[PDB]
Structure 1
Amino acid sequence: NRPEVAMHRNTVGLLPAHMWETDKKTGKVKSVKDSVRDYQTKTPYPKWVQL
């Protein structure tokens, strides 16, 4: 949610924490893991598209 209406409804469950690397002391994101190599999806295109 953007800040205008529902901002307080954001959850910590939205963050993809497993995607990045954090510093213990600061609590800050130092680095980001690579997204593409291990990325598995059953849906490159939407499910209803057969080319």
Structure 2
Amino acid sequence: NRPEVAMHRNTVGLLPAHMWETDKKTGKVKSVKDSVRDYQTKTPYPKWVQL
């Protein structure tokens, strides 16, 4: 949710915390793990498309 209307409705469940690497002391994000290699999706295109 953008700041305007619903902002307080955001949840920590939207956070992909498993994607990055964090500093224990600062509670801040130092590095990012690699996205593309291990990425598995049954749906590159939407389900309803058959090429």
TM-score range, shorter chain: over 0.9
CA-atom RMSD in angstroms: 0.2
Shift of 1:6: 0.1
Question: Residues 12-44 of structure 1: CA distance to partner in whole angstroms, max 9, x if unpaired?
Answer: 000000000000000000000000000000000
Structure 1 length normalisation: TM-score?
0.99
Structure 2 length normalisation: TM-score?
0.99
The 4+ residue runs of structure 1 with deviation greater than 6 A are none
Consecutive unaligned residues in structure 2, runs of 5 or more:
none
Consecutive unaligned residues in structure 1, runs of 5 or more:
none
Q: How many aligned residue pairs are there?
A: 51
Percent identity reads 100
